Scaffold this motif. Sequence first.
Motif, PDB file in Angstrom:
ATOM      1  N   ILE A 196       0.838  -1.295  -0.049  1.00  0.00           N
ATOM      2  CA  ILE A 196       0.051   0.089   0.051  1.00  0.00           C
ATOM      3  C   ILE A 196       0.786   1.213  -0.083  1.00  0.00           C
ATOM      4  O   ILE A 196       0.680   2.049  -0.772  1.00  0.00           O
ATOM      5  CB  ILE A 196      -0.898   0.006   1.291  1.00  0.00           C
ATOM      6  CG1 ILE A 196      -1.845  -1.146   1.019  1.00  0.00           C
ATOM      7  CG2 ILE A 196      -1.868   1.259   1.461  1.00  0.00           C
ATOM      8  CD1 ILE A 196      -2.526  -1.316  -0.178  1.00  0.00           C
ATOM      9  N   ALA A 197       1.903   1.219   0.901  1.00  0.00           N
ATOM     10  CA  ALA A 197       2.651   2.545   1.148  1.00  0.00           C
ATOM     11  C   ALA A 197       3.264   2.972  -0.122  1.00  0.00           C
ATOM     12  O   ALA A 197       3.650   2.141  -0.967  1.00  0.00           O
ATOM     13  CB  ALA A 197       3.598   2.405   2.137  1.00  0.00           C
ATOM     14  N   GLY A 198       3.517   4.404  -0.415  1.00  0.00           N
ATOM     15  CA  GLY A 198       4.309   5.104  -1.312  1.00  0.00           C
ATOM     16  C   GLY A 198       3.537   4.792  -2.816  1.00  0.00           C
ATOM     17  O   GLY A 198       4.047   5.395  -3.846  1.00  0.00           O
TER      18      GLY A 198
ATOM     19  N   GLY B 223      11.080   6.797  -3.572  1.00  0.00           N
ATOM     20  CA  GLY B 223      10.735   8.037  -2.458  1.00  0.00           C
ATOM     21  C   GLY B 223      10.265   8.964  -3.335  1.00  0.00           C
ATOM     22  O   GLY B 223      11.058  10.014  -3.972  1.00  0.00           O
ATOM     23  N   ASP B 224       8.796   9.347  -3.433  1.00  0.00           N
ATOM     24  CA  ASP B 224       8.071  10.315  -4.333  1.00  0.00           C
ATOM     25  C   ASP B 224       7.000  10.884  -3.471  1.00  0.00           C
ATOM     26  O   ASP B 224       6.818  12.043  -3.501  1.00  0.00           O
ATOM     27  CB  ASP B 224       7.581   9.816  -5.451  1.00  0.00           C
ATOM     28  CG  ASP B 224       7.511  10.764  -6.386  1.00  0.00           C
ATOM     29  OD1 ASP B 224       7.137  10.507  -7.625  1.00  0.00           O
ATOM     30  OD2 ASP B 224       7.995  11.968  -6.359  1.00  0.00           O
ATOM     31  N   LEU B 225       6.459  10.001  -2.530  1.00  0.00           N
ATOM     32  CA  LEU B 225       5.360  10.515  -2.021  1.00  0.00           C
ATOM     33  C   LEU B 225       5.704  10.993  -0.689  1.00  0.00           C
ATOM     34  O   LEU B 225       6.219  10.240   0.399  1.00  0.00           O
ATOM     35  CB  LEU B 225       4.588   9.333  -1.500  1.00  0.00           C
ATOM     36  CG  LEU B 225       2.854   9.274  -1.855  1.00  0.00           C
ATOM     37  CD1 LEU B 225       2.158   8.186  -1.031  1.00  0.00           C
ATOM     38  CD2 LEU B 225       2.001  10.694  -1.300  1.00  0.00           C
TER      39      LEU B 225
ATOM     40  N   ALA C 177       4.348   7.153   3.598  1.00  0.00           N
ATOM     41  CA  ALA C 177       5.122   8.376   2.941  1.00  0.00           C
ATOM     42  C   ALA C 177       6.268   7.249   2.404  1.00  0.00           C
ATOM     43  O   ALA C 177       6.671   6.372   3.260  1.00  0.00           O
ATOM     44  CB  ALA C 177       5.288   9.435   3.321  1.00  0.00           C
ATOM     45  N   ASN C 178       7.108   7.515   1.357  1.00  0.00           N
ATOM     46  CA  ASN C 178       8.302   7.363   0.994  1.00  0.00           C
ATOM     47  C   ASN C 178       9.180   8.150   0.758  1.00  0.00           C
ATOM     48  O   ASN C 178      10.356   7.911   0.311  1.00  0.00           O
ATOM     49  CB  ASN C 178       8.268   6.142  -0.062  1.00  0.00           C
ATOM     50  CG  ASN C 178       7.582   6.603  -1.582  1.00  0.00           C
ATOM     51  OD1 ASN C 178       7.389   7.822  -1.648  1.00  0.00           O
ATOM     52  ND2 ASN C 178       7.356   5.857  -2.526  1.00  0.00           N
ATOM     53  N   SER C 179       8.892   9.494   0.845  1.00  0.00           N
ATOM     54  CA  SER C 179       9.982  10.571   0.784  1.00  0.00           C
ATOM     55  C   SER C 179       9.842  11.422   2.137  1.00  0.00           C
ATOM     56  O   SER C 179       8.805  11.603   2.655  1.00  0.00           O
ATOM     57  CB  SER C 179       9.748  11.273  -0.215  1.00  0.00           C
ATOM     58  OG  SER C 179      10.799  12.206  -0.904  1.00  0.00           O
ATOM     59  N   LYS C 180      10.924  12.246   2.067  1.00  0.00           N
ATOM     60  CA  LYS C 180      10.834  13.373   3.493  1.00  0.00           C
ATOM     61  C   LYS C 180      10.553  12.689   4.823  1.00  0.00           C
ATOM     62  O   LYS C 180       9.762  13.209   5.653  1.00  0.00           O
ATOM     63  CB  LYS C 180       9.985  14.337   2.838  1.00  0.00           C
ATOM     64  CG  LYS C 180      10.501  15.061   1.548  1.00  0.00           C
ATOM     65  CD  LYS C 180      10.769  16.687   1.596  1.00  0.00           C
ATOM     66  CE  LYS C 180      10.696  17.336   0.289  1.00  0.00           C
ATOM     67  NZ  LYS C 180       9.466  17.921  -0.230  1.00  0.00           N
TER      68      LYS C 180
END
Lengths: 352, 182
Positions: free
Chosen positions: A69-71, A119-121, A105-108
Amino acid sequence: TPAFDKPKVELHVHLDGAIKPETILYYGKRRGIALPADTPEELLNIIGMDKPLTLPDFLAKFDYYMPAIAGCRDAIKRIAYEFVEMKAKDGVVYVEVRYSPHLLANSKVEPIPWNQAEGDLTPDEVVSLVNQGLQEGERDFGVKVRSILCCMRHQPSWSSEVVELCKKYREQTVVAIDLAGDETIEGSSLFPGHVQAYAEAVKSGVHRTVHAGEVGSANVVKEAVDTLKTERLGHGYHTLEDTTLYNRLRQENMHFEICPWSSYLTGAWKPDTEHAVIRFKNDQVNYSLNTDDPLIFKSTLDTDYQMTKKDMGFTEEEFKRLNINAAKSSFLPEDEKKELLDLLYKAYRMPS
Amino acid sequence: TFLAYAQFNDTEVPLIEYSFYSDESLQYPKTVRVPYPKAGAVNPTVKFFVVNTDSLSSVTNATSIQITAPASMLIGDHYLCDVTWATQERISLQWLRRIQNYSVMDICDYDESSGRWNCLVARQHIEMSTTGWVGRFRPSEPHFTLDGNSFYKIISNEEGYRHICYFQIDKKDCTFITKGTW
Ligand SMILES: *[C@@H]1O[C@H](CO)[C@@H](O[C@@H]2O[C@H](CO)[C@@H](O[C@@H]3O[C@H](CO)[C@@H](O)[C@H](O[C@H]4O[C@H](CO)[C@@H](O)[C@H](O)[C@@H]4O)[C@@H]3O)[C@H](O)[C@H]2NC(C)=O)[C@H](O)[C@H]1NC(C)=O
Ligand SMILES: *[C@@H]1O[C@H](CO)[C@@H](O[C@@H]2O[C@H](CO)[C@@H](O)[C@H](O)[C@H]2NC(C)=O)[C@H](O)[C@H]1NC(C)=O
Ligand SMILES: *[C@@H]1O[C@H](CO)[C@@H](O[C@@H]2O[C@H](CO)[C@@H](O)[C@H](O)[C@H]2NC(C)=O)[C@H](O)[C@H]1NC(C)=O
Ligand SMILES: *[C@@H]1O[C@H](CO)[C@@H](O)[C@H](O)[C@H]1NC(C)=O
Ligand SMILES: [Zn+2]
């Protein structure tokens, strides 16, 4: 079949915990993310419990699916929407939902979660998506829906932006800040970033609930109320171990978000006791019935009501009055809180 | 300023194949093969991006902001079927379900702070049928006003005649400005 076939209110349920097996399976295939099963059906069994294993082997169930699900912005929005619908499948006329925006999330995001690459989300994008989903769902399935953003106990670093998001998305379904994670982590309630968030919450009008007292001392609950200034309590069970606090809480009208079937399965309640809850019933206490994580406990809100009815002699008269407390204690603006009650009284055959 | 674009993924779309003979000089016939979804088969999938051309680097790959799609569409197969710019920083999209009797218009604004496009669900606009499908062949296209806060669009009326409707971007209901048996 229904245990209490009338309008209900739910305050304590996790989004990450309430996902459809089919759409996990769908996003797995699409993304090429490996999964323990292949039927939507027998997958529920690998993720779901029936024996009361404990909090270690429970948190392990998340690793099964969360990576799928994530990202994925497409998935965030969808599980949000699909959730509103499953609540409309139960009696629910108003829900508050909680999730950690950072965990999707996968970013910041401090430690990037669930082993995924960058990592974009960003966690902002996430809340936005989740909102757009809940709002679309309120409209399409007719249940009022507001959301609650979580801080994680082992990650006090994050809780700064959690409350900051809470403030900016106030106009869009986010109404309160939570604090789940691990209770029995040394002096967590006191961590610097955590307390300063709840400080900003009070200073900014953002309502406050806290997972505290589930499996942990009545002192965890004490710090939740005193240092952290919680308005509601996630679970709160082992607070029946300090009668001074317990009785000063009923005094100040504290709300207890209670998850009966969750308790049995997490191990937080041992079956040889009277449930934490039955005390709350005789004691005329302000409290609600919830579900926490339906996917993992393989449940529908009816299971928590069917349990309370069968296992411990609950009656419709009680069910009505705790759903009233729920609305009363809910984190809605006053005027809408009023019309919620209006809706409740009417369908309960009571006045104005 | 902006360049919007669609991306189609045909990965699991079956192939149609047929022979092509060419000039008599070609000893063995060629097999043309093409991604083509016959009825009930597996459709393509789509994504939609907007990029800013003023801020292009030549030192960095250029940033494309995806606009996900209505959650009411994501629950199943769907199509992107109209895009219409409304203002310098406002864009409108129309999505359609694989079962083509339910469609949804989104309206998106550039968000100067975030750098993203945000479409509020309270400017969304549904269009549906029970006698058949939406549109003559697909849903009609909006024609916005200069400021981009209202638009005219040909929709089918109460007795099933296609006439011009007048919408406000954040208001469910429109007013027909023509009627008749035509
Ligand atoms: C267009 O659509 C197609 C299909 O819907 C989609 O194709 C899928 O893409 C994913 C991602 O590339 C593929 O899954 C991968 O398969 C490869 C090859 O065997 C693996 O190496 C991948 O990595 C896995 O393991 C890594 C380390 O353990 C991880 O880093 C990674 O996250 C994975 O866990 C992964 O399994 C999938 O096979 C295809 N599906 C098909 C049918 O081809 C594609 O992404 C879409 N493309 C675009 C532009 O949209
Ligand atoms: C066409 O496109 C953009 C948007 O209409 C214009 O540039 C904007 O100008 C505003 C107002 O002066 C600025 O605050 C923004 O920084 C610009 N927008 C963005 C997001 O880049 C531009 O003026 C127009 N084209 C020209 C060159 O006239
Ligand atoms: C679009 O069409 C579907 C299918 O034609 C409609 O749903 C059908 O109509 C009624 C009520 O749902 C039932 O008698 C049929 O069984 C449905 N058919 C099936 C199998 O889907 C629907 O009303 C239309 N619009 C939508 C989806 O909103
Ligand atoms: C940009 O595009 C791809 C990343 O998908 C990569 O192979 C290339 O090295 C990148 N280079 C630049 C110009 O930043
Ligand atoms: Zn919980």
